[PDB]
């Protein structure tokens, strides 16, 4: 019959042995565990012979679960590709023990059916750093045939943590998943998307884990390295189309550093809420003291957020995963809260103009400004709902109405619904989507600027300088193209808005009309505020042009009060900038 | 050491044997295969002892692949549920053989680490009906621990086929997937969504398979039965929340009948195109003879269609999978083509009114009708783009503008943009979403009907009868509620449109004005056409209220020319009905 050989081998020892169609090798391993200190066990095997027909079959048997594979392991690409790996390392799943100290046995068996010998080296390692300590960085190497996973044990008094994993070289692609502590652990390429919360990453990833979702007060962080970098956004290699010939990928590896850090406590929310309310209520107090002296987008966003919450797939929404603090079912509560200033400040504009109008009516004994105020209020709803799940499908509304508001300003400089609709449809056309665009957009910009100047000695030279600087900005955008058209469009919009604001001031200076102190302070304050507003807008925390794995590279931590990142500062300063721009028009 | 026993057993024989922590059993099986006739091998094992701690570990070793499991198998639910199964059956994957006749060996090994005996019965069956013959129905039983799969070999001269699988009892839920013929086959619960094209189903499913995507001229149909019916849309059982106690599900089984049938050939496409063009060009010929005598929805739909095409997940779009014939990258080309009548017939309306207007101007020597014609043309784009991937996220536009067009008709009966916008926003509000709705909707309907009658002896009695029948329809909708509000809204809209059409005719009859022959024929023809149009609309081929697995139950085959289903007939007759309704207004 078949010859079976047995050995009671030990940890930390590479055994080199031969196997053919006749030999079956059994290795028994004893392992010591305790309830307080749990440590993982890793099986690592190499094959030093090249066989394409009959591989070696390895099985690892435990008390509860069994695992099995074949080496040289063959993984699958995209177009019926076959990648060959010779080294495979896997970490066994050990269910939590009941008794204080129980000795666990596990067996490793080797077999094959090839008619010729084959040499393999096998080693079992007692993985020392199985448990992840809070606030400590651990670096490890993973390839496509060597998935890894570490157990993190929620400390006493921690509500939730964040797992941050970073890498230096962007490629190869990888998947980082969080799973509950229950055998078995899905660390293979095909079942890694079954349960848990997973993110595909190339350089950086961050996953927020809560204790309410894990009753056992622990979880597993599983890292897997893909074979083809198409998911991360790379360019697939143009290897010959071999249907039944496996091609080796050479040396592909990923070095990753993982750190689990406690998240913000409840104070961060209270300080962030009090700070936001304190800033905007100060304008209400100041105005009282002075007086004394989209639906379909909402449905899509809600559906996508529910899909993210229930599926565990975190590749749908483009959050700022490094600084995004959840509350309830909302995954990034600070991003929603940052738009509260739109509501309060737009409503303050309605108060101030209502006071002005009633004063004028009493003395005697405005619709466009109301439209701008209502647009500002609508920002606080539409942009807030967008940030519940940012994506390329529903991105236009985040900045579109903003351009629309600018139009109203321009209209009050020219002195309605038709021009607003034209602006909305042009924004939709432009954001539907590219060197041909890079050229046609510049041509259309030049033509539109010339026509706008024509419709409007000092004036002709002034418009010539405006067109010259506009063409300079167009060439700037065309040459390097460091950012998307979405940022560029808002940039040219605000620059042209301040540009026309300055032209009106210059026309006033050429006349004998003297600007009062209040409008002068208003224009200066609005301009300086818009400065930092554009500064923070040009950061680009998350970009939706590329794959989400790439979009994760530009995440940055919380900057203000440990609650708000740069985009929230953009919201905060954009609200003030529009308030000042409107007050410039009102008091002009 | 460990005691290993060996036996060279045979097919079609149940072996009952005992295993404990000391015994390891090996069974060698010889198998005969040929290139022309490939037949599958199934391993079936039962355990007759109840053990919760230490299960039996079974491994099946082949020349190329290894498989392993443990019984009593434990599957996972939704809220850390554990279901226990005692019978497991799996079909081995056999790579295609090179030589004409090669004998394949495979081994089955049994082990366990429990300190007490355990009895198991194991049997290997040479599955006779492994290959699926075209146009033949095969019935089989699958449970959650007994996934099955059959090989379908594309015949000579068949471009593409459709796999139709049906069941009688709606539960339990299941997943039906199509995969290429390459070891291994992902028939487990966790990896069934890795590759291939898969649909979750409860009663019916249909998957279209093409030869260009399968270079080996064959594929695998894999059926898996889930554990919890939440995905299919059922109600989860309220078993006690046992974290570490597995609960048996009793006897859960699914009987399925599968049939692979060649798809429509190239002629059906040509006959369908010539039929569609022939119908609409006949109206152009008739008019010449008589004369001689949304963007964001488009982006979302495109993204979802690409996601379906590349992911293999067919649960995103709610097609009529029984009658949906693809072409190029489009998955249901007939559904898109059925809207061509909107374009042609709306454009014919523009021709006829342009002729009428130029005749009037020449004799002397209309904007609202143009708006309706343009709305009809816009249907042919918006509804066509919707049908590329129907879903609850983009459904509003499929029927929304429909009511909007009706409004224009009503307006020309009352004799614009404001009422149209009000109708659009009310449709959005109503379709955002429910007994509270079932009552409030009826109340609002009654109030709106009364107000509309008030704004408009014979008249008062006439409006009283109209309100009475409208309340009758409201009670009809409220009592049984067999369909969604989406069908009901269009139903009441068209009924009220014909109702006002008839009221105007009655007002004409009460006067001495005699209706000319042409308008009388027009009203009669429009009414009879709208009859069958509503008849075909009330069918409900696909409903998006429930889960897609349930939405698949109401699929029906092609009815007209083997290319068009009922919804295409609804499109065809709705186009004619609006053309007749418009011609009624023009010649009134
Ligand atoms: C686990 O098993 C190993 C394998 O037998 C044990 O290692 C042996 O221990 C004895 C006791 O001192 C030595 O005499 C042998 O030389 C060891 N084997 C080898 C290959 O060196 C080990 O002791 C076991 N663990 C425990 C806790 O008993
Ligand atoms: C991860 O892999 C890298 C690359 O093999 C390792 O870096 C090498 O480490 C060895 C041992 O210290 C050095 O001799 C080489 O010079 C290093 N090469 C490079 C390019 O850095 C790294 O040590 C591995 N990390 C771990 C934790 O094993
Ligand atoms: C496959 O293996 C089985 C198991 O040995 C073979 O069955 C035996 O065949 C011989 C030849 O006639 C009989 O004398 C034995 O009694 C059979 N075994 C049993 C348990 O009945 C079978 O012949 C093999 N297949 C082929 C094609 O040789
Ligand atoms: C699928 O399972 C059903 C239910 O067990 C089988 O139906 C039974 O078949 C046996 C054998 O003919 C009869 O004695 C029972 O009366 C049947 N019960 C019912 C409720 O129909 C059915 O035969 C199985 N199908 C297959 C292909 O095995
Ligand atoms: C079977 O193989 C084992 C493994 O090397 C060996 O120790 C044993 O002597 C062999 N038995 C026979 C009868 O050759
Ligand atoms: C394990 O830790 C618990 C408290 O964390 C302690 O009570 C117990 O004594 C520890 N076990 C041992 C063996 O020290
Ligand atoms: C703990 O050990 C005792 C004796 O060593 C044994 O009887 C008991 O079954 C063990 N606990 C478990 C959960 O097996
Ligand atoms: C494998 O190696 C051993 C020792 O070198 C040798 O005796 C044996 O014949 C080899 N196997 C085969 C199939 O030749
Ligand atoms: C080992 O177990 C096998 C299986 O029953 C048996 O045939 C054999 O006699 C046993 N050997 C010893 C030494 O007990
Ligand atoms: C298998 O089929 C091919 C053609 O389909 C035929 O040429 C060949 O002879 C067949 N093989 C045998 C063993 O008959
Ligand atoms: C086919 O059989 C011959 C002799 O029986 C053998 O030499 C050859 O290797 C076999 N083909 C394959 C692909 O193994
Ligand atoms: C299993 O059954 C055999 C035969 O009845 C018996 O000899 C053996 O002792 C049993 N196993 C144990 C662990 O008692």
mmCIF file of C-alpha atoms in Angstrom, chain B residues 239-501:
data_model
loop_
_atom_site.group_PDB
_atom_site.id
_atom_site.type_symbol
_atom_site.label_atom_id
_atom_site.label_comp_id
_atom_site.label_asym_id
_atom_site.label_seq_id
_atom_site.Cartn_x
_atom_site.Cartn_y
_atom_site.Cartn_z
ATOM 1 C CA UNK B 239 -34.354 31.751 17.608
ATOM 2 C CA UNK B 240 -32.708 32.476 20.982
ATOM 3 C CA UNK B 241 -29.487 34.489 20.756
ATOM 4 C CA UNK B 242 -27.022 31.668 21.426
ATOM 5 C CA UNK B 243 -23.486 32.910 20.804
ATOM 6 C CA UNK B 244 -21.655 29.564 21.046
ATOM 7 C CA UNK B 245 -24.529 27.067 20.696
ATOM 8 C CA UNK B 246 -25.263 25.813 17.149
ATOM 9 C CA UNK B 247 -28.924 25.279 16.260
ATOM 10 C CA UNK B 248 -30.022 22.722 13.689
ATOM 11 C CA UNK B 249 -32.267 23.992 10.906
ATOM 12 C CA UNK B 250 -34.238 20.741 10.643
ATOM 13 C CA UNK B 251 -34.974 19.566 7.100
ATOM 14 C CA UNK B 252 -34.298 22.429 4.687
ATOM 15 C CA UNK B 253 -34.053 21.491 1.018
ATOM 16 C CA UNK B 254 -34.583 22.971 -2.425
ATOM 17 C CA UNK B 255 -35.807 21.057 -5.471
ATOM 18 C CA UNK B 256 -34.678 22.766 -8.671
ATOM 19 C CA UNK B 257 -35.292 22.094 -12.359
ATOM 20 C CA UNK B 258 -32.627 23.363 -14.767
ATOM 21 C CA UNK B 259 -32.853 23.656 -18.554
ATOM 22 C CA UNK B 260 -30.254 25.051 -20.963
ATOM 23 C CA UNK B 261 -31.810 26.363 -24.169
ATOM 24 C CA UNK B 262 -30.153 27.946 -27.202
ATOM 25 C CA UNK B 263 -30.789 31.706 -27.271
ATOM 26 C CA UNK B 264 -32.457 33.681 -30.108
ATOM 27 C CA UNK B 265 -30.413 33.506 -33.364
ATOM 28 C CA UNK B 266 -29.412 36.534 -35.496
ATOM 29 C CA UNK B 267 -32.697 36.444 -37.497
ATOM 30 C CA UNK B 268 -34.923 37.276 -34.493
ATOM 31 C CA UNK B 269 -32.874 40.516 -34.203
ATOM 32 C CA UNK B 270 -33.427 41.348 -37.903
ATOM 33 C CA UNK B 271 -37.170 40.475 -37.718
ATOM 34 C CA UNK B 272 -37.559 42.551 -34.487
ATOM 35 C CA UNK B 273 -35.744 45.581 -36.052
ATOM 36 C CA UNK B 274 -37.717 45.350 -39.348
ATOM 37 C CA UNK B 275 -41.007 44.947 -37.405
ATOM 38 C CA UNK B 276 -40.321 48.004 -35.168
ATOM 39 C CA UNK B 277 -39.201 50.186 -38.141
ATOM 40 C CA UNK B 278 -42.077 48.867 -40.344
ATOM 41 C CA UNK B 279 -44.768 49.853 -37.770
ATOM 42 C CA UNK B 280 -43.456 53.405 -37.210
ATOM 43 C CA UNK B 281 -42.512 54.130 -40.878
ATOM 44 C CA UNK B 282 -46.134 53.176 -41.797
ATOM 45 C CA UNK B 283 -47.279 56.351 -39.912
ATOM 46 C CA UNK B 284 -44.791 58.458 -41.941
ATOM 47 C CA UNK B 285 -46.115 56.886 -45.186
ATOM 48 C CA UNK B 286 -49.744 57.458 -44.027
ATOM 49 C CA UNK B 287 -49.056 61.167 -43.199
ATOM 50 C CA UNK B 288 -47.342 61.705 -46.614
ATOM 51 C CA UNK B 289 -50.300 59.975 -48.373
ATOM 52 C CA UNK B 290 -52.777 62.194 -46.424
ATOM 53 C CA UNK B 291 -50.734 65.354 -47.254
ATOM 54 C CA UNK B 292 -50.619 64.303 -50.963
ATOM 55 C CA UNK B 293 -54.411 63.661 -50.859
ATOM 56 C CA UNK B 294 -31.606 62.984 -16.510
ATOM 57 C CA UNK B 295 -27.861 63.195 -17.105
ATOM 58 C CA UNK B 296 -26.894 62.021 -13.568
ATOM 59 C CA UNK B 297 -29.321 59.138 -14.071
ATOM 60 C CA UNK B 298 -27.448 58.326 -17.290
ATOM 61 C CA UNK B 299 -24.102 58.334 -15.472
ATOM 62 C CA UNK B 300 -25.461 56.136 -12.669
ATOM 63 C CA UNK B 301 -26.953 53.693 -15.185
ATOM 64 C CA UNK B 302 -23.692 53.484 -17.142
ATOM 65 C CA UNK B 303 -21.664 52.907 -13.970
ATOM 66 C CA UNK B 304 -24.070 50.212 -12.763
ATOM 67 C CA UNK B 305 -24.041 48.461 -16.143
ATOM 68 C CA UNK B 306 -20.236 48.439 -16.160
ATOM 69 C CA UNK B 307 -20.286 47.124 -12.579
ATOM 70 C CA UNK B 308 -22.616 44.304 -13.634
ATOM 71 C CA UNK B 309 -20.507 43.525 -16.704
ATOM 72 C CA UNK B 310 -17.152 43.368 -14.894
ATOM 73 C CA UNK B 311 -18.194 42.118 -11.440
ATOM 74 C CA UNK B 312 -20.360 39.199 -12.523
ATOM 75 C CA UNK B 313 -23.009 40.175 -9.971
ATOM 76 C CA UNK B 314 -26.409 40.135 -11.684
ATOM 77 C CA UNK B 315 -28.402 41.365 -8.668
ATOM 78 C CA UNK B 316 -27.922 45.055 -9.484
ATOM 79 C CA UNK B 317 -30.262 45.559 -12.455
ATOM 80 C CA UNK B 318 -33.878 44.370 -12.552
ATOM 81 C CA UNK B 319 -34.060 43.103 -16.119
ATOM 82 C CA UNK B 320 -36.619 40.685 -17.507
ATOM 83 C CA UNK B 321 -34.008 37.928 -17.511
ATOM 84 C CA UNK B 322 -36.293 35.455 -19.306
ATOM 85 C CA UNK B 323 -36.774 37.736 -22.348
ATOM 86 C CA UNK B 324 -33.756 40.056 -22.577
ATOM 87 C CA UNK B 325 -31.510 39.652 -25.608
ATOM 88 C CA UNK B 326 -28.072 41.315 -25.454
ATOM 89 C CA UNK B 327 -25.980 42.938 -28.163
ATOM 90 C CA UNK B 328 -22.499 44.334 -27.664
ATOM 91 C CA UNK B 329 -22.095 45.408 -24.048
ATOM 92 C CA UNK B 330 -25.825 46.097 -23.632
ATOM 93 C CA UNK B 331 -27.509 43.342 -21.636
ATOM 94 C CA UNK B 332 -31.143 43.877 -22.738
ATOM 95 C CA UNK B 333 -31.144 45.293 -26.264
ATOM 96 C CA UNK B 334 -34.845 44.714 -26.980
ATOM 97 C CA UNK B 335 -35.833 46.854 -23.990
ATOM 98 C CA UNK B 336 -33.788 49.735 -25.410
ATOM 99 C CA UNK B 337 -35.027 49.207 -28.974
ATOM 100 C CA UNK B 338 -38.680 49.248 -27.893
ATOM 101 C CA UNK B 339 -38.479 53.018 -27.286
ATOM 102 C CA UNK B 340 -37.615 53.809 -30.919
ATOM 103 C CA UNK B 341 -41.312 54.387 -31.569
ATOM 104 C CA UNK B 342 -41.268 57.324 -29.174
ATOM 105 C CA UNK B 343 -38.617 59.025 -31.306
ATOM 106 C CA UNK B 344 -40.210 58.323 -34.691
ATOM 107 C CA UNK B 345 -43.783 59.118 -33.679
ATOM 108 C CA UNK B 346 -42.929 62.274 -31.738
ATOM 109 C CA UNK B 347 -40.911 63.446 -34.733
ATOM 110 C CA UNK B 348 -43.881 62.698 -37.008
ATOM 111 C CA UNK B 349 -45.950 64.984 -34.790
ATOM 112 C CA UNK B 350 -43.435 67.767 -35.418
ATOM 113 C CA UNK B 351 -43.703 67.149 -39.169
ATOM 114 C CA UNK B 352 -47.506 67.243 -39.186
ATOM 115 C CA UNK B 353 -47.760 70.401 -37.105
ATOM 116 C CA UNK B 354 -45.056 72.110 -39.169
ATOM 117 C CA UNK B 355 -47.089 71.321 -42.289
ATOM 118 C CA UNK B 356 -50.253 72.653 -40.635
ATOM 119 C CA UNK B 357 -48.498 75.844 -39.503
ATOM 120 C CA UNK B 358 -46.928 76.579 -42.891
ATOM 121 C CA UNK B 359 -50.299 75.966 -44.561
ATOM 122 C CA UNK B 360 -51.951 78.402 -42.141
ATOM 123 C CA UNK B 361 -49.266 81.034 -42.759
ATOM 124 C CA UNK B 362 -49.561 80.651 -46.540
ATOM 125 C CA UNK B 363 -53.353 80.962 -46.326
ATOM 126 C CA UNK B 364 -53.135 84.077 -44.140
ATOM 127 C CA UNK B 365 -50.768 85.775 -46.613
ATOM 128 C CA UNK B 366 -48.779 76.133 -31.304
ATOM 129 C CA UNK B 367 -45.852 76.146 -28.893
ATOM 130 C CA UNK B 368 -47.539 73.823 -26.399
ATOM 131 C CA UNK B 369 -47.934 71.102 -29.030
ATOM 132 C CA UNK B 370 -44.219 71.447 -29.795
ATOM 133 C CA UNK B 371 -43.511 71.058 -26.076
ATOM 134 C CA UNK B 372 -45.520 67.826 -25.984
ATOM 135 C CA UNK B 373 -43.725 66.551 -29.085
ATOM 136 C CA UNK B 374 -40.350 67.292 -27.515
ATOM 137 C CA UNK B 375 -41.451 65.554 -24.303
ATOM 138 C CA UNK B 376 -42.401 62.502 -26.368
ATOM 139 C CA UNK B 377 -38.963 62.583 -28.003
ATOM 140 C CA UNK B 378 -37.289 62.919 -24.585
ATOM 141 C CA UNK B 379 -39.145 59.787 -23.473
ATOM 142 C CA UNK B 380 -37.335 57.823 -26.184
ATOM 143 C CA UNK B 381 -34.014 58.808 -24.591
ATOM 144 C CA UNK B 382 -34.761 58.874 -20.857
ATOM 145 C CA UNK B 383 -36.818 55.673 -20.706
ATOM 146 C CA UNK B 384 -34.338 53.940 -23.022
ATOM 147 C CA UNK B 385 -31.425 54.883 -20.760
ATOM 148 C CA UNK B 386 -33.402 53.745 -17.713
ATOM 149 C CA UNK B 387 -33.943 50.275 -19.184
ATOM 150 C CA UNK B 388 -30.180 49.784 -19.579
ATOM 151 C CA UNK B 389 -30.250 49.012 -15.837
ATOM 152 C CA UNK B 390 -33.624 49.343 -14.068
ATOM 153 C CA UNK B 391 -33.343 49.844 -10.316
ATOM 154 C CA UNK B 392 -35.170 51.517 -7.402
ATOM 155 C CA UNK B 393 -32.527 54.310 -7.610
ATOM 156 C CA UNK B 394 -33.362 55.351 -11.226
ATOM 157 C CA UNK B 395 -37.004 54.181 -11.564
ATOM 158 C CA UNK B 396 -38.691 57.599 -11.106
ATOM 159 C CA UNK B 397 -37.742 58.815 -14.645
ATOM 160 C CA UNK B 398 -39.154 55.663 -16.339
ATOM 161 C CA UNK B 399 -42.753 56.751 -15.557
ATOM 162 C CA UNK B 400 -42.318 60.308 -14.184
ATOM 163 C CA UNK B 401 -42.176 62.297 -17.431
ATOM 164 C CA UNK B 402 -45.123 60.119 -18.524
ATOM 165 C CA UNK B 403 -47.366 61.905 -16.023
ATOM 166 C CA UNK B 404 -45.704 65.194 -16.963
ATOM 167 C CA UNK B 405 -46.811 64.736 -20.572
ATOM 168 C CA UNK B 406 -50.339 64.065 -19.331
ATOM 169 C CA UNK B 407 -50.206 67.418 -17.566
ATOM 170 C CA UNK B 408 -49.534 69.204 -20.847
ATOM 171 C CA UNK B 409 -52.635 67.548 -22.289
ATOM 172 C CA UNK B 410 -54.648 68.738 -19.303
ATOM 173 C CA UNK B 411 -53.210 72.221 -19.799
ATOM 174 C CA UNK B 412 -54.385 72.341 -23.405
ATOM 175 C CA UNK B 413 -57.778 71.234 -22.127
ATOM 176 C CA UNK B 414 -57.690 74.093 -19.611
ATOM 177 C CA UNK B 415 -56.764 76.606 -22.336
ATOM 178 C CA UNK B 416 -47.200 75.637 -18.089
ATOM 179 C CA UNK B 417 -43.662 75.339 -16.739
ATOM 180 C CA UNK B 418 -44.846 76.048 -13.187
ATOM 181 C CA UNK B 419 -47.487 73.305 -13.220
ATOM 182 C CA UNK B 420 -44.985 70.973 -14.893
ATOM 183 C CA UNK B 421 -42.429 71.612 -12.143
ATOM 184 C CA UNK B 422 -45.114 71.098 -9.492
ATOM 185 C CA UNK B 423 -46.047 67.766 -11.090
ATOM 186 C CA UNK B 424 -42.391 66.699 -11.275
ATOM 187 C CA UNK B 425 -41.714 67.562 -7.632
ATOM 188 C CA UNK B 426 -44.934 65.890 -6.456
ATOM 189 C CA UNK B 427 -43.954 62.763 -8.389
ATOM 190 C CA UNK B 428 -40.531 62.854 -6.722
ATOM 191 C CA UNK B 429 -42.128 63.253 -3.280
ATOM 192 C CA UNK B 430 -44.569 60.407 -3.886
ATOM 193 C CA UNK B 431 -41.916 58.081 -5.302
ATOM 194 C CA UNK B 432 -39.441 58.749 -2.485
ATOM 195 C CA UNK B 433 -41.386 55.945 -0.768
ATOM 196 C CA UNK B 434 -47.084 52.020 4.544
ATOM 197 C CA UNK B 435 -50.698 52.141 5.722
ATOM 198 C CA UNK B 436 -50.300 55.763 6.823
ATOM 199 C CA UNK B 437 -49.376 56.554 3.226
ATOM 200 C CA UNK B 438 -52.261 54.355 2.045
ATOM 201 C CA UNK B 439 -54.672 56.625 3.963
ATOM 202 C CA UNK B 440 -53.032 60.040 3.514
ATOM 203 C CA UNK B 441 -52.708 59.432 -0.235
ATOM 204 C CA UNK B 442 -56.443 58.732 -0.493
ATOM 205 C CA UNK B 443 -57.284 61.829 1.568
ATOM 206 C CA UNK B 444 -55.032 64.013 -0.595
ATOM 207 C CA UNK B 445 -56.537 62.480 -3.738
ATOM 208 C CA UNK B 446 -60.059 63.327 -2.562
ATOM 209 C CA UNK B 447 -59.081 66.882 -1.596
ATOM 210 C CA UNK B 448 -57.221 67.495 -4.867
ATOM 211 C CA UNK B 449 -60.108 66.135 -6.943
ATOM 212 C CA UNK B 450 -62.589 68.359 -5.097
ATOM 213 C CA UNK B 451 -60.377 71.429 -5.548
ATOM 214 C CA UNK B 452 -59.838 70.667 -9.245
ATOM 215 C CA UNK B 453 -63.591 70.295 -9.744
ATOM 216 C CA UNK B 454 -64.189 73.570 -7.888
ATOM 217 C CA UNK B 455 -61.671 75.480 -10.016
ATOM 218 C CA UNK B 456 -63.306 74.158 -13.198
ATOM 219 C CA UNK B 457 -76.275 71.916 -13.141
ATOM 220 C CA UNK B 458 -74.603 69.673 -15.709
ATOM 221 C CA UNK B 459 -71.107 70.613 -14.533
ATOM 222 C CA UNK B 460 -71.783 70.034 -10.826
ATOM 223 C CA UNK B 461 -73.442 66.636 -11.325
ATOM 224 C CA UNK B 462 -70.737 65.690 -13.833
ATOM 225 C CA UNK B 463 -67.938 66.536 -11.389
ATOM 226 C CA UNK B 464 -69.816 64.734 -8.603
ATOM 227 C CA UNK B 465 -69.872 61.549 -10.693
ATOM 228 C CA UNK B 466 -66.196 62.025 -11.524
ATOM 229 C CA UNK B 467 -65.331 62.413 -7.842
ATOM 230 C CA UNK B 468 -67.469 59.381 -6.955
ATOM 231 C CA UNK B 469 -65.700 57.104 -9.425
ATOM 232 C CA UNK B 470 -62.336 58.566 -8.363
ATOM 233 C CA UNK B 471 -63.108 57.670 -4.744
ATOM 234 C CA UNK B 472 -64.139 54.215 -5.959
ATOM 235 C CA UNK B 473 -60.709 53.821 -7.571
ATOM 236 C CA UNK B 474 -59.065 55.145 -4.399
ATOM 237 C CA UNK B 475 -60.900 52.550 -2.296
ATOM 238 C CA UNK B 476 -59.931 49.888 -4.841
ATOM 239 C CA UNK B 477 -56.278 50.842 -4.443
ATOM 240 C CA UNK B 478 -56.548 51.090 -0.661
ATOM 241 C CA UNK B 479 -58.325 47.803 0.073
ATOM 242 C CA UNK B 480 -56.304 44.997 -1.507
ATOM 243 C CA UNK B 481 -53.160 46.888 -2.581
ATOM 244 C CA UNK B 482 -51.981 44.241 -5.083
ATOM 245 C CA UNK B 483 -49.478 46.496 -6.860
ATOM 246 C CA UNK B 484 -47.141 49.356 -6.021
ATOM 247 C CA UNK B 485 -48.012 53.054 -5.925
ATOM 248 C CA UNK B 486 -45.991 53.462 -9.132
ATOM 249 C CA UNK B 487 -48.500 51.501 -11.220
ATOM 250 C CA UNK B 488 -51.464 53.021 -9.374
ATOM 251 C CA UNK B 489 -50.338 56.608 -10.015
ATOM 252 C CA UNK B 490 -50.057 56.106 -13.769
ATOM 253 C CA UNK B 491 -53.369 54.230 -13.713
ATOM 254 C CA UNK B 492 -55.267 57.087 -12.053
ATOM 255 C CA UNK B 493 -53.497 59.564 -14.325
ATOM 256 C CA UNK B 494 -54.557 57.872 -17.562
ATOM 257 C CA UNK B 495 -58.051 57.154 -16.229
ATOM 258 C CA UNK B 496 -58.510 60.825 -15.325
ATOM 259 C CA UNK B 497 -57.101 61.848 -18.716
ATOM 260 C CA UNK B 498 -59.643 59.733 -20.608
ATOM 261 C CA UNK B 499 -62.246 60.895 -18.091
ATOM 262 C CA UNK B 500 -61.655 64.573 -18.904
ATOM 263 C CA UNK B 501 -61.455 63.693 -22.613
#
